[PDB]
């Protein structure tokens, strides 16, 4: 075949340049004839940076608000580098209920009371006035 | 066991977690008799004369012996008068 | 009843069993049965949240051994107005 | 009667033989055959629970080796009034 | 005749080769064709019990190699009255 | 034309390529395109026996690598009179 | 709103839950649900590009664990005037 | 134009994205969307031979990794008049 | 039609064959056949630039092995006004 | 019939033997003889598809060794309406 | 149809099976059967050439293993006027 | 009766035991005995398909050893309407 | 008597010798002689079963080594009514 | 006379020489010539036993050489009354 | 002195052939079979060869000619 | 002319050559052409003993190399009166 | 013409091709077809000596490879009036 | 005289020498001369089958040496009616 | 002058030299100049047989050297009346 | 202008490319194209001396590759008045 | 004058150029340009003998390498009156 060519090559880039191997019925094909299991990442494995809407664990595809590394701005250096700051080493001691879940608690002597004592050893968590268990 | 009419379908969404969720049917010794209740192991429609087993028999009648049932429905009398 | 119970199953026999177990267990109106295509049949109920929870839990266990199992069993306490358009009203 | 005999199979040929056997074994009226989609074909009979229990055992055995096979075979003694709305009344 | 022969096949192309060899081979008439769904096309031919038998072995050999293959082949010596409703009366 | 060429394919894209090839190859009319289900589409042509033979081979070769591809390729030079009832007459 | 949000799922129950979350999460309108076949059900919302992004993400996490799951979650910030025709305008 | 472009996909979500990339990439009119069954959705475009080629290539790339994905992406510069009877003239 | 597509050949069989393959492949009119003398037969086809390129390429492959093969297969996107005088307007 | 048989030869003596063998062997009408130039002479026999293949086969063997020989023998079962113009309709 | 296809077999049983296979296979008319003598029995059919080819190929395969076997299978795309006097004719 | 059973044996002594065994075994009407020539005799029977299959099996087994054996034994459940003419209407 | 006796031979000279031997030995009545064709000649001799068995043994031995030899020697104690038609009732 | 002198030969020419030599030699009377088939031509004479022996030996010697030859040469000093029924009475 | 085929001496008037009698000696042939009139002086296949039987006891048409010469619309294989 | 000359042959072609050479050589009338069977054809002439002697010799040389050949050639100057009965008076 | 051209073959099928190529190739009338017996069939043509020679050579080559084959291909320029009686005057 | 003898030559001079020889040495009329192009000239003479053979050997010998010489010499014993259209009728 | 003289040459310049040399050597008329095709030009002169032999010989020598050369140089002393109709009467 | 630019090229496809390139890449005008015969086709342009030089070189390089290719490319800056008579002169 | 110079050339570019050289060089009148076919093109000039010799030498030197070349260059100083008829009087 000679003359003006509409056949696809790299220098003349555009729509004709893409999807070679998926397209069929093209004058080139006729001459020749003659992934991830789940859309969304494992829930346990990934803790999302911004939670709720803005979660990135689900691979929403096409015209989504995600910006790739090549796109720059409104995040990272553009937000963090704006204000000068210095983090200081502070002795971090927390006095709170969660922190005191494991405080050393003294040995608890049980109840040696007998007779019509509704006390159950399973229910010894209770303490009576004077600090007396049961 | 005893032949007891079904009056309505009892619903409790704050029942013990050990019950899982079997169907529940208010039962009647007869209309005008005490509205006792059964775990409906054998499916029964309201307005159905249904035999109900009781005691530990009702418990293994449902999924497990540990299952919390005092009355279970173990059938529907085919034809009853 | 605003709450929507649903029980999808792989076939109609499992779905009808689930529906019988759902309507018998609680007072819930069987709004519709949908043939989703590819062997999926979805029986939906609309009732009080407590009644719907009792129904869909009862239906899930009953149909879990009936042939192919339950694809899903879902309880929706409140359905948005937009969703109500696609929800069936009366069985067809 | 009110009991529902259900047999789901993988094709029309296993269902028709199942339905021949169910109607032949006991006095159960064929109330319809549904096309679930995906290859599943269901048959429904409405008769007294004794007739539905005898029929279904016969149909499940009759179509067990016929065609692809049998997916389900269930007997419901009393079908709730609400579920009756999603049951075919006469064959189409 | 009152006997019923049936040949389910994956695809219409196998169902027509099976239906063309069933009617040609023996004394049977196509009583109808139904699209089961999921890619299955059941063919039905009714005639004398020997003719329906000869039609369904000839048809089975014809379409086992054509297309995907043969899902089922079956003969019902006599069909109950209830089941005849679900059967196609006639393509005509 | 009585000869029934029939090219089943997986999808409507392999079926419209095959149909184009078949109609172009020889004097055959596209009597009907049928959606079997399970993603099978069977194009049926009817013409003289020689025109059907040429069309089927052209359609088989054209769409063997288009989309999923060819499921079946069959030529019935003279379908039985009973079979003619189930075959499509004009594409719908 | 012009942006189109899609969440294909396997079955109606994951789709209804997905649509429940998508409409509740952001101010998007459910333009319809289409039963694709093969057990796929697509829920479509049209709204603002920012709002649809929130709805598609909210629906994708909700329906992932509900039933068979989500085939895909997609957004089309600007739909061409030609695509509009195949898009359902309103379920009701 | 009379050239036909066709992107078959597994699902409506891969096909709407293919439909949107095809119409936006080239001067093509989307003539119809067809639910084949078995979860296949074929989006057919019409237009000039050069334009249809540009549309199909762009549409195939966009939908290659959307949902289950692309099954076929074919171009037929001229379709016989007989095949035009199985092509939808305008979409719904 | 504007773009000229010309396939020269040695003989009127290779050229009629090539001409059938050009007009069939894409939307191109056969504007004439010229007996160049010396055994050369030219088939000129005028149509849009894309259709002509598809037609000539299809004709080239089709007539290469037919007898004595193609001598030429040139595609001119837009012939100059003066050149149109020497081009045949219609076939004789 | 609209099939076209073609037998090109390196002379008129091999094209008249070819023409006699083609017309005698099968029911095909001798539409024309065309002196191409370069000594090539072509005899065309339009007829049915089965008849034209046989006719072009008989013509091929008879004049393969007559004179110089047969340059081409080609079968087209369907020639486009555009190619019909360049085709000779009646013999001269 | 003018073309004649004849299958000669050693014995009446292969000939009748041949005539059954040849008539069922394609649009040919059994004119009559001739008892040649020595065992040879020729079944002659008449019809369009492509149909006769499909029939004579079908009848040869049919009677090749039956009985003694095949003596000869043959096609004549056109039969001279003088020959028809010696052909069985008398289809009646 | 429509089904035709034909046992050809070298000699009339092996074809009188073949026929005695054939008639006795099942209800079949002996339509004719034909001396093909060259020592071949063909006993033909017409009856129900079940009877013919049982008959020819009996006749073939009985004459395998009597005199010279059986050249053939064949069953054609529905000989085409054209083939009825060559079949003998009654034995002479 | 109702029993039949048979001695096929390769010639009329062995057949006549066998007939003479059979009639002279026991109380059997030659019911006729049939020229099978191909050289075979059958002698049918009826009588009481014991007499026929003795006659056939005598017949076989007399003509076993005369002219071309013996082909068959069969005894039927009782033949069916249908077989009587093919048998020659009266000598001729 | 009652004796039967037979001489079977492989051809009418040998048979006529044999008959000419037999009728001339002794006082036997030619009773008829029977065409057995397959080349066998028997010649039967009837006269006193001594004459029949002389005729048979004279006929065998004369026609042994002639043509293909002499298959048999028999003398039956007395023929039973039953055998005379199958015997040719006389040429006149 | 005469004998039967099985070895029986027949002792009286002899019709057996003699050196001194001339008209009688036309045949000394064992070919005569059946009843035995003169003294001392298995067949299993057709002895004629019908031509159909001699010949060992795929399609020949216009379509089977020009095997490689023809190019064209491909027909199903 | 009482002398009879007879040339047996294997086929009618040698027999007609022989009859032609026999009737051409001498003044002998072709008194009959008898189909013996099994491929044997006998041509008989009656004339003067000298004319028959010359005719059969000429026929013998003529048909020996034609077709399968000459089985026999015989000359009898006079036939017995009884033998004349079996001879054909006129050629049928 | 009066010259006689005969072709004897083994079977009817070789004779019909031998006759078809005799009357197509040359200007010879088909005077008749004879069943010799033994599986031999002669084909007689009458015409001018030049036409018969060309006809007998075309017929001989055409039937050599059809079926069992050609036995004889003989030409007689002049046939005596005595031989005319045995020849078939008109085809049967 | 429906036979046709064509002698092709590389030039007009050998053709006229061949036409002079062909018409001088047989009763063959000269039906015309054709300029095939490329130098080939075809001289066609139509007469009796024998005369045409005499004319074309005489013509072939005469022009085998003159000029470039004989390309082809062919004898067609009978010319089909269709071919006569392309044949030159007569210069007269 | 009945005698004709032709000198084909490979070109018009050699042909005109030959014509000048021929009509100058002897009293012959230039009846015609034909363009055979493929570069061949013929020059014919009709004259007294002596004047034609002299003219053709002179023309051959003159134009042998001229241009591409001399193809043939042939003298016919008398042309048949049929050959005259293919000869040019007056030059053009 | 007066200057002339001729491009002789084997075939009409190279000639049309050359004409297009000559008329597009210069101010020349296409006076005409003359099929020389023998395969050659010349395209002539008349214009200014500078334009013709550019036209010929552009046309020569463009088509040298197309088809068989360039035979000659010549510029005649001035053509004599006598040589303007054998030119195409007016384009149309 | 009447001297005829003639330069034959392979192609028309070497002739239209030899004509320019011949008419420019000497006082000669271009009388014609004849297409001989085969590619040859003879350009004739008529003038004084001295001028024609100068012109042809000019034409010959010019066209030798301009194209495929020059076939001939001949000068005839006087031309016979008979030759005038075939020579072109004025150019076209």
Residue numbers in the entry:
A (entry chain Y): 702 to 735, 770 to 869
B (entry chain U): 1 to 81
C (entry chain K), D (entry chain L), E (entry chain I), F (entry chain N), G (entry chain M), H (entry chain J), ...: 6 to 97
O (entry chain X): 607 to 647, 685 to 700, 712 to 731
What's the paper's own text on this?
Among diverse BMCs, carboxysomes are specific CO2-fixing BMCs found in all cyanobacteria and many proteobacteria. The carboxysome uses a polyhedral protein shell to encapsulate the key CO2 fixation enzymes, ribulose-1,5-bisphosphate carboxylase/oxygenase (Rubisco) and carbonic anhydrase (CA). Carboxysome shells are typically composed of three groups of structural components that form hexamers, pentamers, and trimers. Here, we generated recombinant α-carboxysome shells of Halothiobacillus neapolitanus by expressing all the shell proteins (involving three CsoS1 hexameric proteins and two CsoS4 pentameric proteins), together with the C-terminal domain of CsoS2 (CsoS2-C) that mediates shell assembly.
The cryo-EM structures of T = 9, T = 9 Q = 12, T = 13, T = 16, and T = 19 shell assemblies were determined at 2.3-, 2.99-, 2.93-, 2.75-, and 3.04-Å resolution, respectively. The resulting shell structures show various sizes, with a maximal size of 54 nm, representing the largest synthetic icosahedral BMC shells to date that are suitable for in-depth structural analysis. The T = 9 shell has a minimum of four different interfaces, whereas the T = 19 shell has a maximum of 10 different interfaces. Notably, structural analysis of the large T = 19 shell revealed the highest number of CsoS2-C fragments and additional binding details. The five fragments cover a substantial portion of entire CsoS2-C (Ser604-Gly869). F3 and F4 belong to the same region of CsoS2-C (Ile702-Arg735). Closer inspection revealed that F3 has a sequence overlap with F4, although their conformations differ. Nevertheless, our results indicate that CsoS2-C adopts at least two distinct conformations for interacting with the shell. Intriguingly, the smaller T = 9 shells involved only one conformation of CsoS2-C, whereas the second conformation of CsoS2 appeared in the larger T = 13, T = 16, and T = 19 shells.
